[PDB]
mmCIF file of C-alpha atoms in Angstrom:
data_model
loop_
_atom_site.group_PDB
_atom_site.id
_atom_site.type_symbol
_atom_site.label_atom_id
_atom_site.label_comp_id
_atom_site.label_asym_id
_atom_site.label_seq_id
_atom_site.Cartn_x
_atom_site.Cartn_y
_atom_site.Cartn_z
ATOM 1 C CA UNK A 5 16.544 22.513 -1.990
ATOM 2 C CA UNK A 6 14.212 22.705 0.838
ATOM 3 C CA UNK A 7 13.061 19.301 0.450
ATOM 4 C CA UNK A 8 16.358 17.747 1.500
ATOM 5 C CA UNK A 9 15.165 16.669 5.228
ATOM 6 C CA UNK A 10 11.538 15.546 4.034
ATOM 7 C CA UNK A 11 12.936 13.196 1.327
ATOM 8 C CA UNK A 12 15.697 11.464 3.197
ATOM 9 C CA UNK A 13 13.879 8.550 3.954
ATOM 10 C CA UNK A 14 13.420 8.445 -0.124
ATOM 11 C CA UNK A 15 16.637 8.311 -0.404
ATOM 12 C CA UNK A 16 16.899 4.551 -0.217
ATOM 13 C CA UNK A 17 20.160 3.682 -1.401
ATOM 14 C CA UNK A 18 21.475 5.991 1.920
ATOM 15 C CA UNK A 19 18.683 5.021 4.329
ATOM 16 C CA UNK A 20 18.430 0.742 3.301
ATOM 17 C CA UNK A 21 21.175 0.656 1.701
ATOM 18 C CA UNK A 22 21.109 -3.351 0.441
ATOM 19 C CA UNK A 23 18.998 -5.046 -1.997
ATOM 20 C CA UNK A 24 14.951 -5.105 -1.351
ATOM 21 C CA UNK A 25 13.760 -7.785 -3.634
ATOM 22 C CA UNK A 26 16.243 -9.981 -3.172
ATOM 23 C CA UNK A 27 18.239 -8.672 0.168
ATOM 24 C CA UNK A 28 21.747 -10.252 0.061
ATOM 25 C CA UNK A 29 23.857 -7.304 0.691
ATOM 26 C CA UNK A 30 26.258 -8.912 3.265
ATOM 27 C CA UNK A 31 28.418 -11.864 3.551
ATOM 28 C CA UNK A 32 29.091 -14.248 6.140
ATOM 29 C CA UNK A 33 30.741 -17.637 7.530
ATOM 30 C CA UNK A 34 29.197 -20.472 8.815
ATOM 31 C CA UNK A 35 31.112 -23.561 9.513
ATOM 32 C CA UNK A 36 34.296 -23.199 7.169
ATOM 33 C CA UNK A 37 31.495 -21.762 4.532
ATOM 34 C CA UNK A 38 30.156 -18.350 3.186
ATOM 35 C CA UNK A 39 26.743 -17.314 2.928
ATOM 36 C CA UNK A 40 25.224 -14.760 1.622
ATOM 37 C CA UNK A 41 22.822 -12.822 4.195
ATOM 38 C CA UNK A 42 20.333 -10.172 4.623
ATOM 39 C CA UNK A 43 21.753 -6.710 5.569
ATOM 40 C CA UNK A 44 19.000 -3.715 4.349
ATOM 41 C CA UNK A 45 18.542 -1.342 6.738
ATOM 42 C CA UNK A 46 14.984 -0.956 6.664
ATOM 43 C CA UNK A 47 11.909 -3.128 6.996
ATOM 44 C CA UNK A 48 10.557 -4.617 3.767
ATOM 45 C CA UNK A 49 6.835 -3.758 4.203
ATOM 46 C CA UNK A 50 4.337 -6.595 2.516
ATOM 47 C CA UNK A 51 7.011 -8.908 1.222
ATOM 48 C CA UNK A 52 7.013 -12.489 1.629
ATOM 49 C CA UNK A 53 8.182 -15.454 -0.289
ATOM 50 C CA UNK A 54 5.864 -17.467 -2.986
ATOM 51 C CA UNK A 55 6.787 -20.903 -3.360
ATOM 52 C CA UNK A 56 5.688 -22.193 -6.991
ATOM 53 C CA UNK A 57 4.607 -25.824 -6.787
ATOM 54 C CA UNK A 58 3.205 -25.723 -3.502
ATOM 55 C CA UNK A 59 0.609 -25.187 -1.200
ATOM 56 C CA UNK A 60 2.527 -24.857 1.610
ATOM 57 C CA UNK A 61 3.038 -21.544 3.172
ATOM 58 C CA UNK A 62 6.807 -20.410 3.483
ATOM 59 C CA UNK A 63 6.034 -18.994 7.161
ATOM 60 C CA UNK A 64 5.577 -22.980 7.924
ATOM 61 C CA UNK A 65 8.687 -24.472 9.639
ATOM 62 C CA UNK A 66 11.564 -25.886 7.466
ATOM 63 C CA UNK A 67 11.161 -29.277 6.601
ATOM 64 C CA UNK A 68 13.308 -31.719 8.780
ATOM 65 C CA UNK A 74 9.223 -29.329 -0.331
ATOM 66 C CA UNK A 75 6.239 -29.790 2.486
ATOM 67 C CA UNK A 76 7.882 -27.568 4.688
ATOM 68 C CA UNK A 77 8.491 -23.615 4.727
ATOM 69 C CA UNK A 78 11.172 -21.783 5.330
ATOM 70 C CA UNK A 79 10.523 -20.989 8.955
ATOM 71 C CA UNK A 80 12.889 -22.106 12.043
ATOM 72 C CA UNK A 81 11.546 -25.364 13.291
ATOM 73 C CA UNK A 82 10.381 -26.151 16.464
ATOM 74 C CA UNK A 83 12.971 -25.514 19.536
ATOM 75 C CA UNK A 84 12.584 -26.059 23.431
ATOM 76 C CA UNK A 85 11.733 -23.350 24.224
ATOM 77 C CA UNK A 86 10.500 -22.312 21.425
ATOM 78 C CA UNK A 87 12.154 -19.624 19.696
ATOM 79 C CA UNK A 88 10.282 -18.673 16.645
ATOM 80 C CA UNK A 89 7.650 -18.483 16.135
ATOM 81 C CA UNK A 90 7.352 -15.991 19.225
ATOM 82 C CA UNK A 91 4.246 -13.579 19.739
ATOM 83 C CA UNK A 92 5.638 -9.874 20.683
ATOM 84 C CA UNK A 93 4.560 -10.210 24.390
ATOM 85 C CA UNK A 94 6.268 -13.469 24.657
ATOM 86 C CA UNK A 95 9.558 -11.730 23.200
ATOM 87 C CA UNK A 96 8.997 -8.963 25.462
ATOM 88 C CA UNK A 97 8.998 -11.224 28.370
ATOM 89 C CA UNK A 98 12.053 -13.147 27.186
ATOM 90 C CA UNK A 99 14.109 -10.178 27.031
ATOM 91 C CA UNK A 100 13.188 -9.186 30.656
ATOM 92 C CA UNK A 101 16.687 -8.395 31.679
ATOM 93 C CA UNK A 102 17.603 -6.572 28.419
ATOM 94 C CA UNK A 103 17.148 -2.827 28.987
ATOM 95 C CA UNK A 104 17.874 -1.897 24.979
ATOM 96 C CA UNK A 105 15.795 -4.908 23.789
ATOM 97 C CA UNK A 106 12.594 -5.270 25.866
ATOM 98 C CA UNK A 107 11.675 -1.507 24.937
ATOM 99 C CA UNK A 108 12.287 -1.890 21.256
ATOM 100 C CA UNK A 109 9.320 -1.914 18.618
ATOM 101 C CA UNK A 110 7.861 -4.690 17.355
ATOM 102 C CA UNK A 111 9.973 -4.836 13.837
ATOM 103 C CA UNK A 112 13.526 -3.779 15.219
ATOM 104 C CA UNK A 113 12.738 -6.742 18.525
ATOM 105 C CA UNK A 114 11.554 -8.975 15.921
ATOM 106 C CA UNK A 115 15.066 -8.381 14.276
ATOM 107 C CA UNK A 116 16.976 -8.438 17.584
ATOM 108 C CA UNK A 117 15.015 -12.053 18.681
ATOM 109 C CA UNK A 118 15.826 -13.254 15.196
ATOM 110 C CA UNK A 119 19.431 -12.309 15.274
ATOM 111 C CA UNK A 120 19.858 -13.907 18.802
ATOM 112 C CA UNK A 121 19.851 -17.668 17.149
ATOM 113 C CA UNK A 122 23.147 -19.192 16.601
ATOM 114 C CA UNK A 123 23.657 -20.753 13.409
ATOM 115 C CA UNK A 124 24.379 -24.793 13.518
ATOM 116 C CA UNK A 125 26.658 -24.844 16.017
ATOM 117 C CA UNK A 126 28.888 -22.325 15.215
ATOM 118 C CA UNK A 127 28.881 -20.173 18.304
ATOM 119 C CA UNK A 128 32.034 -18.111 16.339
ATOM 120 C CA UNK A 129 30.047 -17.177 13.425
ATOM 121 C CA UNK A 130 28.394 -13.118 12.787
ATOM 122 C CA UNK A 131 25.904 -14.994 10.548
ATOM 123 C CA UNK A 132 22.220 -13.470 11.654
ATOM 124 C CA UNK A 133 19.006 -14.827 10.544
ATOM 125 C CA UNK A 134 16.360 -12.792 8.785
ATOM 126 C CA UNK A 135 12.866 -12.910 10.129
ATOM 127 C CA UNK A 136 8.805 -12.183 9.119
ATOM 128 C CA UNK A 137 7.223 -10.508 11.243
ATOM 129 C CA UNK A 138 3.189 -10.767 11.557
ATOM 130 C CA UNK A 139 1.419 -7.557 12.198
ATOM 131 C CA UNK A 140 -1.687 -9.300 12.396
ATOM 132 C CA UNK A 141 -1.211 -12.120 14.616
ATOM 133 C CA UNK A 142 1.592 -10.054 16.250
ATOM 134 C CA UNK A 143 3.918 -12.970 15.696
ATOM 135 C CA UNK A 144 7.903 -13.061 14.995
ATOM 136 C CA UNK A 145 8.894 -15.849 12.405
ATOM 137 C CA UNK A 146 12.504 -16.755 12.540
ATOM 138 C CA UNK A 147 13.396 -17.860 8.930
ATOM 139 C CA UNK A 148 15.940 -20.104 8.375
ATOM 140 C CA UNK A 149 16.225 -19.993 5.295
ATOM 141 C CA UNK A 150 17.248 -16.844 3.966
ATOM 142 C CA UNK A 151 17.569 -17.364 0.384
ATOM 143 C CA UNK A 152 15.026 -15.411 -1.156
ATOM 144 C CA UNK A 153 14.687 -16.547 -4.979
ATOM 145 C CA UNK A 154 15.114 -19.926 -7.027
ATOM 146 C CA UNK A 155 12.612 -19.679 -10.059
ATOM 147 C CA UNK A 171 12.102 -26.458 -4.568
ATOM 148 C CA UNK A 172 11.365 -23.336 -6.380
ATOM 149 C CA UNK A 173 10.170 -20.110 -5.162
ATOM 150 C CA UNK A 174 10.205 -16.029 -5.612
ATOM 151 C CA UNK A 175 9.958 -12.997 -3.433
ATOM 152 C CA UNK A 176 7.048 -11.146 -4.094
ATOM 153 C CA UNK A 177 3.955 -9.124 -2.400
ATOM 154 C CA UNK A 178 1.067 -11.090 -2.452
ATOM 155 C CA UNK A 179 -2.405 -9.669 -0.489
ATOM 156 C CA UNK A 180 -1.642 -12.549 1.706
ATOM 157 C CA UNK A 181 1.362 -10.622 2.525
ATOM 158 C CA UNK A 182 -0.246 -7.355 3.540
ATOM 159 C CA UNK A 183 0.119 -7.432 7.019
ATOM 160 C CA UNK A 184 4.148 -9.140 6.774
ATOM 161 C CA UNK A 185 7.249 -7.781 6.762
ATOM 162 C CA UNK A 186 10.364 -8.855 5.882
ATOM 163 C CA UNK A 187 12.957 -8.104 8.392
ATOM 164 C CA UNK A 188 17.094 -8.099 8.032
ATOM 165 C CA UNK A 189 19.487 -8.335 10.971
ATOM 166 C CA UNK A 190 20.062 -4.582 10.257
ATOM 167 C CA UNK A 191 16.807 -3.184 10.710
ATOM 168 C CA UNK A 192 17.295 -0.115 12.663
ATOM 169 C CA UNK A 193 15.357 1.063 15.241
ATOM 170 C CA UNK A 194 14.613 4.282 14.547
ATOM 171 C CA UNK A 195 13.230 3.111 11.121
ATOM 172 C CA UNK A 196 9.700 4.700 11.962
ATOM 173 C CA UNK A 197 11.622 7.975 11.197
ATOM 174 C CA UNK A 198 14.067 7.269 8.898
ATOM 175 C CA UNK A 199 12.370 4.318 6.783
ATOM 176 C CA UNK A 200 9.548 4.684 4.018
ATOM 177 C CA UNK A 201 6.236 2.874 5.256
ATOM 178 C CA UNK A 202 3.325 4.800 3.986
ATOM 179 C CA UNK A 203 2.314 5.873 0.499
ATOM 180 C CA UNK A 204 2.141 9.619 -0.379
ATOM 181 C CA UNK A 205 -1.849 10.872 -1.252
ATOM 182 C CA UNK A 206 -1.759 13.455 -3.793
ATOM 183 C CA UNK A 207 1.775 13.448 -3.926
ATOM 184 C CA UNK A 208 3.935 12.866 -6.934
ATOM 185 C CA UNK A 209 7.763 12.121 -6.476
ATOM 186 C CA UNK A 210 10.461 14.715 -8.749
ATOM 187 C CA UNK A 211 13.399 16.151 -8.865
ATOM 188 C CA UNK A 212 14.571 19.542 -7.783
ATOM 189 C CA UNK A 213 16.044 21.471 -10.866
ATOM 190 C CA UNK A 214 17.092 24.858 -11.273
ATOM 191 C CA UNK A 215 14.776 26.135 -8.194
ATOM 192 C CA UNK A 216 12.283 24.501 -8.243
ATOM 193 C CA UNK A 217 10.247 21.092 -8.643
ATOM 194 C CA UNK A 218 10.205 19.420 -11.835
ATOM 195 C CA UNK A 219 9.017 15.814 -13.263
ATOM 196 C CA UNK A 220 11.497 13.237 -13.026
ATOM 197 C CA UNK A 221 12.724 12.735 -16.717
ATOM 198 C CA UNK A 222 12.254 9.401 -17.385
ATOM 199 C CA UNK A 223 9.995 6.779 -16.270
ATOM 200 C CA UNK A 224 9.033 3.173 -17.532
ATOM 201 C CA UNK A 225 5.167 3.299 -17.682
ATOM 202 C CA UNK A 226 2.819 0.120 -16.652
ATOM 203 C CA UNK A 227 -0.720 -0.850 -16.209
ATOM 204 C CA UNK A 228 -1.630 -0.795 -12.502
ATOM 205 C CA UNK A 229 -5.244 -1.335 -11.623
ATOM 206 C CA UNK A 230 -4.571 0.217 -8.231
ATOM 207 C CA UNK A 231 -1.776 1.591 -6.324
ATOM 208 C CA UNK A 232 -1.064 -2.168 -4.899
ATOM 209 C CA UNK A 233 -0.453 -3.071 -8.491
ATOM 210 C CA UNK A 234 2.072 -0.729 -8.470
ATOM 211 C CA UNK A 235 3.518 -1.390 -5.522
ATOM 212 C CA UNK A 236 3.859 -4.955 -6.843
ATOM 213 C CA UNK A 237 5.543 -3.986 -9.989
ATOM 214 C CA UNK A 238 7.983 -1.055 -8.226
ATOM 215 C CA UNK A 239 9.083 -4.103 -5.766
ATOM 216 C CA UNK A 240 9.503 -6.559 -8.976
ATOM 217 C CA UNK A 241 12.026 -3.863 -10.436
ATOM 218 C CA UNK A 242 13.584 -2.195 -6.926
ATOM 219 C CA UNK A 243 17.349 -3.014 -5.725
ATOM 220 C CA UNK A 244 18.324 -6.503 -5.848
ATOM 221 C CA UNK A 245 21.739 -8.403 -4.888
ATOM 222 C CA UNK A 246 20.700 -11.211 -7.473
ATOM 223 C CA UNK A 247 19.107 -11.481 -11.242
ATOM 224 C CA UNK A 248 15.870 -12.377 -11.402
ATOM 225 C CA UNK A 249 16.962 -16.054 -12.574
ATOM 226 C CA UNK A 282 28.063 -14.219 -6.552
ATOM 227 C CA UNK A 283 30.746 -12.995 -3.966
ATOM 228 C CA UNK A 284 31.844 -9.624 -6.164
ATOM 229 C CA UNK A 285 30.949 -6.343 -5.083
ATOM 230 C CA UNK A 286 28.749 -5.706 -8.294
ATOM 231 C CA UNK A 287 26.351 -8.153 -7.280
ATOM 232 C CA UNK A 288 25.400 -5.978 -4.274
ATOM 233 C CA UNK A 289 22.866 -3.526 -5.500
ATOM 234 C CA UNK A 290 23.371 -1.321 -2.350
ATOM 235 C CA UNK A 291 20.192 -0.044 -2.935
ATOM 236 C CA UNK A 292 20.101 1.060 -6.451
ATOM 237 C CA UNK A 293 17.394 0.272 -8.380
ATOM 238 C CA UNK A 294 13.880 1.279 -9.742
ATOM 239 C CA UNK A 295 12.649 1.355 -6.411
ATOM 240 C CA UNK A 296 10.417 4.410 -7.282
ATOM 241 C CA UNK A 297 7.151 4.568 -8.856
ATOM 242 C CA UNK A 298 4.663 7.446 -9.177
ATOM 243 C CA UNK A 299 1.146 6.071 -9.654
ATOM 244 C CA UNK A 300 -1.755 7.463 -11.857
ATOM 245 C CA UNK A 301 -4.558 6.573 -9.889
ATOM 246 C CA UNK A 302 -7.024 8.201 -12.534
ATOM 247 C CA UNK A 303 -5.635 6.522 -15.588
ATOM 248 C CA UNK A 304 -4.197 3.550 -13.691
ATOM 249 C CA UNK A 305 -0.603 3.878 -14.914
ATOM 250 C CA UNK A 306 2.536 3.105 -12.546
ATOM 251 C CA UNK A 307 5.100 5.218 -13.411
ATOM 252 C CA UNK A 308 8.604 3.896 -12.459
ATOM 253 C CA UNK A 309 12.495 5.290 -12.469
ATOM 254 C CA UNK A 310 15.391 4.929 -10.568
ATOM 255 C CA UNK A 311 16.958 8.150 -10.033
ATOM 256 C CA UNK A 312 16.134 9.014 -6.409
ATOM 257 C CA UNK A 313 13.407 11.690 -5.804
ATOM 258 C CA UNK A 314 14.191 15.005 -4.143
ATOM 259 C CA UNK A 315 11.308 16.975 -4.243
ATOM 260 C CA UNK A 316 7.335 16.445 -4.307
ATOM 261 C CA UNK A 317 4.774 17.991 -6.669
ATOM 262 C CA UNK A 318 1.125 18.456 -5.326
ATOM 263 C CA UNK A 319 -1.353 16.443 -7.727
ATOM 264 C CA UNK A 320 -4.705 14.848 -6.962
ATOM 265 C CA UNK A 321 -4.632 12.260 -9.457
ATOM 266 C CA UNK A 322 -1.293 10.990 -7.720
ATOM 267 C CA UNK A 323 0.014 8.468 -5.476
ATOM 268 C CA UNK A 324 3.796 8.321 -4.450
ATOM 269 C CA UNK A 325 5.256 4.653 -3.669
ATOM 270 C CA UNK A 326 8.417 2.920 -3.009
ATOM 271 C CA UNK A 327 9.778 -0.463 -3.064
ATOM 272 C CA UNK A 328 10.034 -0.894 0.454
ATOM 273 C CA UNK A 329 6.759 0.800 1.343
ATOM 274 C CA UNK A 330 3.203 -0.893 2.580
ATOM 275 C CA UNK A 331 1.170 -1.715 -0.590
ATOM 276 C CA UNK A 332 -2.112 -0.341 1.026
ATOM 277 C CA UNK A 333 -1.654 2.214 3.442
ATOM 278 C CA UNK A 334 -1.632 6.303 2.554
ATOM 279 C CA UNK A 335 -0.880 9.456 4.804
#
């Protein structure tokens, strides 16, 4: 296969490796307590979290139901933090102050102690704002409860993403982030490129759509309404969807691409990746 290189950052069980709808791949203690925690690799590109029965915006600080589940004001303040102020605040940080926006967003996030608990590995998740250029520390990290709320990509959410402790920082090269033009994702068989098998078929008015609906089915460490391993998607899910553009179809599987097949009327997605943006 001489596709192997150009689809490793496909390969999203290997390269994310955690849940991307709901991201609860690791565990932690806080306090005598264990919590369940972000841990995917990658950025989540466009996700954010709707809460249902609210007006409120979850990128609002925590409430101390009208609150969000943002960290709440601090002296200094620590989130939320626009990238030059982060850049300035890790002045003496060789590693940090050089980072990208996402991974230092990840870094800032995961420099908060949790309640006290100066012993504990436990590392908040954060947003990050590409438009305002903002970091949001969230502290909350639960992710679904549907005070009830759902993870989801909203056009609101276009310009967020979502943001374990373990976002790497070479994830521009190793991470999905733009969709595929003319591209259609399949599977290398007996020499050569061939469709991929099987795929659940949806209605998608446009390649957002089925963005949306790939991210409703991708990887997910809980059911859509515990402590054991299988609970942990590790990645595996339908996290893959070839979209129709011309008859407005998403195409979706979960057996991980490894080749591509030129075709005009294509575009090729993932869970992870922007809704909007093409290459």
């Amino acid at each position: 296969n001489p596709w192997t290189e150009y689809m490793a950052k496909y390969d999203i069980e290997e390269v994310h490796g955690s849940g991307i709808r709901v991201d609860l791949g690791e565990d932690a203690e806080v306090a005598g307590t264990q919590y369940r925690l972000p841990s995917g690799k990658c950025p989540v590109f466009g996700k954010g979290i709707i809460i249902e029965n609210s007006n409120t915006t979850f990128l609002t600080p925590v409430a101390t139901k009208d609150g969000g589940f943002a960290f709440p004001p601090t002296e200094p303040l620590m989130s939320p933090m626009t990238l030059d102020e982060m850049r300035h605040f890790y002045k003496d940080n060789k590693y940090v102050k050089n980072l990208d926006e996402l991974t230092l967003c990840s870094r800032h996030a995961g420099n908060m102690i949790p309640d006290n608990d100066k012993n504990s590995n436990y590392k908040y998740p954060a947003v990050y704002d590409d438009k305002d250029k903002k970091c949001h520390i969230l502290y909350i990290a639960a992710q679904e409860n549907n005070f009830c709320f759902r993870p989801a990509k909203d056009i609101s959410f276009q310009n967020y993403t979502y943001l374990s402790k373990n976002v790497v920082d070479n994830w521009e090269k190793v991470c999905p982030r733009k969709n595929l033009q003319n591209a259609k994702f399949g599977l290398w068989v007996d020499g050569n490129c061939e469709d991929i098998p099987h795929v659940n078929e949806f209605p998608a008015i446009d390649l957002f759509e089925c963005n949306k609906l790939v991210f409703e089915l991708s990887a997910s460490d809980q059911p859509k309404q515990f402590k054991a391993d299988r609970y942990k998607s590790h990645g595996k899910g339908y996290n893959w969807g070839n979209y129709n553009t011309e008859t407005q179809k998403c195409e979706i599987f979960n057996v991980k691409p490894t080749c591509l097949i030129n075709n005009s009327s294509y575009i090729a997605t993932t869970a992870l990746s922007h809704p909007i943006e093409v290459e």
